[PDB]
Amino acid sequence: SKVTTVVATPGQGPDRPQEVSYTDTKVIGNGSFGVVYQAKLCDSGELVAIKKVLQDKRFKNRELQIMRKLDHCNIVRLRYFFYSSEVYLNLVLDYVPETVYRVARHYSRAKQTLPVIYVKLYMYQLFRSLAYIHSFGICHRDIKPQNLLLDPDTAVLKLCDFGSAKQLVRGEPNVSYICSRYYRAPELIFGATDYTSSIDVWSAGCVLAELLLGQPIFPGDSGVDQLVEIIKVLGTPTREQIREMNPNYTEFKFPQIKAHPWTKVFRPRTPPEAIALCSRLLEYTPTARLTPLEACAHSFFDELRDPNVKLPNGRDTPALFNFTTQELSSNPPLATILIPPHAR
Amino acid sequence: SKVTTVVATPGQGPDRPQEVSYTDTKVIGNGSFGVVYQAKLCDSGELVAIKKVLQDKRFKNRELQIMRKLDHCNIVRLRYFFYSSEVYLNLVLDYVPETVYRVARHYSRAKQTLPVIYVKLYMYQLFRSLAYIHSFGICHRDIKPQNLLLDPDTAVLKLCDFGSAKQLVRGEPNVSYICSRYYRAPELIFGATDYTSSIDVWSAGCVLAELLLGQPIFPGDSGVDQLVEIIKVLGTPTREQIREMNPNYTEFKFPQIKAHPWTKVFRPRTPPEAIALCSRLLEYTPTARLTPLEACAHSFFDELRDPNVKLPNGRDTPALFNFTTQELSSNPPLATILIPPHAR
Numbered sequence: 001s002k003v004t005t006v007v008a009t010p011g012q013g014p015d016r017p018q019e020v021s022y023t024d025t026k027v028i029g030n031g032s033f034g035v036v037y038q039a040k041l042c043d044s045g046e047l048v049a050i051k052k053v054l055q056d057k058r059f060k061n062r063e064l065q066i067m068r069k070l071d072h073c074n075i076v077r078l079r080y081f082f083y084s085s086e087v088y089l090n091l092v093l094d095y096v097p098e099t100v101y102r103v104a105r106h107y108s109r110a111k112q113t114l115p116v117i118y119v120k121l122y123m124y125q126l127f128r129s130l131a132y133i134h135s136f137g138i139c140h141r142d143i144k145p146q147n148l149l150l151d152p153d154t155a156v157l158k159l160c161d162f163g164s165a166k167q168l169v170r171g172e173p174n175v176s177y178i179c180s181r182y183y184r185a186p187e188l189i190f191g192a193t194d195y196t197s198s199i200d201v202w203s204a205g206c207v208l209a210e211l212l213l214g215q216p217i218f219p220g221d222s223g224v225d226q227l228v229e230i231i232k233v234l235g236t237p238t239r240e241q242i243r244e245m246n247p248n249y250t251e252f253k254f255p256q257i258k259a260h261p262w263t264k265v266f267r268p269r270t271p272p273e274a275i276a277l278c279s280r281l282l283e284y285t286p287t288a289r290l291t292p293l294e295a296c297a298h299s300f301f302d303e304l305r306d307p308n309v310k311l312p313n314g315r316d317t318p319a320l321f322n323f324t325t326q327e328l329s330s331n332p333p334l335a336t337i338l339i340p341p342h343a344r
Numbered sequence: 345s346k347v348t349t350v351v352a353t354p355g356q357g358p359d360r361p362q363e364v365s366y367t368d369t370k371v372i373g374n375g376s377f378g379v380v381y382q383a384k385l386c387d388s389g390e391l392v393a394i395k396k397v398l399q400d401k402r403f404k405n406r407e408l409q410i411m412r413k414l415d416h417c418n419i420v421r422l423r424y425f426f427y428s429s430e431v432y433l434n435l436v437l438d439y440v441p442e443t444v445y446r447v448a449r450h451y452s453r454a455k456q457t458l459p460v461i462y463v464k465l466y467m468y469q470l471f472r473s474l475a476y477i478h479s480f481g482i483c484h485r486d487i488k489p490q491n492l493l494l495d496p497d498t499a500v501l502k503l504c505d506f507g508s509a510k511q512l513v514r515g516e517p518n519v520s521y522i523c524s525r526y527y528r529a530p531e532l533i534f535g536a537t538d539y540t541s542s543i544d545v546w547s548a549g550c551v552l553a554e555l556l557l558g559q560p561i562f563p564g565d566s567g568v569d570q571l572v573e574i575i576k577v578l579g580t581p582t583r584e585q586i587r588e589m590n591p592n593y594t595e596f597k598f599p600q601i602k603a604h605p606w607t608k609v610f611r612p613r614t615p616p617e618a619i620a621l622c623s624r625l626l627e628y629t630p631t632a633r634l635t636p637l638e639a640c641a642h643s644f645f646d647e648l649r650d651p652n653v654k655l656p657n658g659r660d661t662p663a664l665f666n667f668t669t670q671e672l673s674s675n676p677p678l679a680t681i682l683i684p685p686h687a688r
């Protein structure tokens with residue numbers, strides 16, 4: 001096995017490069033996110049992911065700029081970055097072996113559903129990572145099961161792939177063509193260019209619904225099919241809601257469809273608190289969607305705040321309450337529900 | 345087995361309903377297109393598809409309206425329609441057992457590529473179906489391998505699913521959110537609302553490319569990823585090309601990427617005329633795209649006009665030259681290439 005040694009800049013510290021040696025280098029992925037390698041750090045034995053992309057001549061790397069800012073337990077951390085041979089930017093990242101996508105698929109093909117305790121744990125930790133990035137005004141713009149990494153032993157979840165992520169500035173236009181099939185907020189389907197970070201929340205509501213249902217709640221390979229499914233559940237959007245999504249669309253015909261009672265969407269066993277949470281995430285009107293911090297404080301996650309909760313393997317839960325002031329900034333009073341007595 | 349008798353209106357003739365008896369009714373599909381049944385006509389023994397959808401109170405059914413107009417050998421024909429019980433519209437359709445989607449998939453996972461004779465036959469016949477519908481000004485808006493039905497013995501291809509099809513009128517706005525992942529013209533990805541029938545042609549170019557490559561040419565679950573793949577091949581769009589796709593998008597950053605020579609996109613054995621055809625289908629500028637009729641007259645399909653061509657199973661080719669005046673209207677002089685000497 002090759003040992004590769006690079007001079008690399010720590011992700012968030014002061015700009016002081018270090019000689020970093022790594023080995024066991026194999027490709028684990030190859031997509032629009034570029035080539036991703038897994039490797040092992042010679043010093044610590046810790047496994048890392050290395051994401052390598054070609055670095056444009058003219059611009060700054062947006063993903064790097066965003067990742068240098070972030071340090072949170074539910075987001076894959078940028079450990080180091082370095083340049084290599086045309087120039088390549090390499091990001092040395094936390095390695096997390098599983099994904100919500102693969103796990104939901106194991107359960108689905110075994111004709112079982114993910115135990116609700118995992119739904120609570122994973123979704124809670126997704127919402128934390130969202131409260132955190134949204135507090136910088138960063139929108140991920142591609143929340144989907146594949147971007148939710150999991151450790152099966154600790155039940156830690158980390159959000160990954162910040163290749164779409166962008167600081168959203170009010171009044172500054174954003175491309176509508178972000179977000180992946182199944183997970184796109186209706187305003188994106190309509191072509192909104194003035195959407196907010198609440199698209200990440202819609203996407204998370206779709207993930208939650210998917211974990212509860214055992215399949216995507218709004219399937220469709222085209223926006224038209226996706227909208228049909230959304231309307232089957234939410235009912236037809238009002239004139240107001242449509243104009244908000246896209247002002248140029250008020251003229252189009254829209255079948256008058258009645259709302260499907262949210263309880264009937266899901267299986268009979270489904271906790272009513274899970275259903276209530278979905279309904280407050282999957283709202284046509286962006287401002288009517290819960291914030292990630294309010295999602296965390298939702299009663300669906302009450303069980304996680306019980307001092308006696310344990311993982312199915314017997315272990316303690318992962319870190320759920322180490323909220324910072326930055327994390328809490330959107331609504332500091334929520335810290336009362338959020339940080340329970342035993343964790344203070 | 346149930347024998348069901350309905351009073352149904354013939355698809356395109358005079359409005360004179362007939363008693364139609366069918367049997368062997370089974371569900372073959374269920375999606376946004378509705379429930380689709382296969383069944384057998386008691387009189388003739390012919391297998392049919394029956395597409396059943398809920399009919400809105402307020403409007404006419406647009407699909408019905410379009411299907412009643414069409415009669416073409418490469419389009420699934422509306423034989424009859426009837427109402428049943430709220431009220432359900434039932435379309436009685438040609439039944440065709442296979443799809444380009446399923447066939448490309450058999451070859452793909454056997455690590456073989458579809459023989460080029462089939463690529464010619466299928467693509468030619470797709471383009472005929474498009475020349476035909478476009479001559480009514482009808483745009484299908486969801487050309488994808490799944491909507492290309494095939495008879496494996498006769499190598500006849502029929503376009504199906506007119507659920508998103510629409511007569512496109514200049515100056516009248518159209519929803520952008522049609523077309524399926526992999527097959528969307530960049531103008532749709534950009535949210536164009538003033539696109540033309542030429543999106544169907546982009547989509548067909550993606551199908552051709554897919555059949556030659558063994559996999560989609562522009563994969564991606566988000567428009568972002570799709571555009572990355574499109575740009576990797578076509579080079580970055582010029583300012584003018586962008587402005588045409590969406591006027592509001594001119595200010596956005598766009599990495600300068602060189603065009604990848606079209607010859608290097610495909611495997612080495614790939615016929616040069618197939619590549620030439622692709623590059624004329626997959627153009628940023630909509631009016632730069634070949635018309636379906638011009639696509640049919642392309643040299644890639646020269647082999648189909650050879651008096652000696654046969655199907656691999658020994659049979660004659662299916663009907664390829666019975667062009668009508670309606671079909672030829674976009675460009676009547678093309679009939680000189682299109683209808684070869686032996687076929688006149």
Ligand SMILES: Cn1cc(C2=C(c3cccc(NC[C@H](O)CO)c3)C(=O)NC2=O)c2cc(F)ccc21
Binds near residue numbers: 099149160161
């Ligand atoms: C399991 N796994 C973790 C990956 C990790 C990423 C990573 C980096 C960039 C993109 C993606 N995308 C999601 C990936 O495809 C998993 O579904 C993941 C990271 O930052 N840390 C990891 O452990 C990863 C990447 C892949 F390309 C393929 C599988 C991966």
Ligand SMILES: Cn1cc(C2=C(c3cccc(NC[C@H](O)CO)c3)C(=O)NC2=O)c2cc(F)ccc21
Binds near residue numbers: 372439441493
């Ligand atoms: C093989 N096949 C032909 C189908 C036929 C359709 C039909 C009608 C409506 C939608 C679609 N969609 C494509 C289908 O899903 C096959 O990929 C196909 C038609 O008009 N004639 C047919 O023989 C069909 C429908 C299904 F739902 C599933 C499989 C089908």
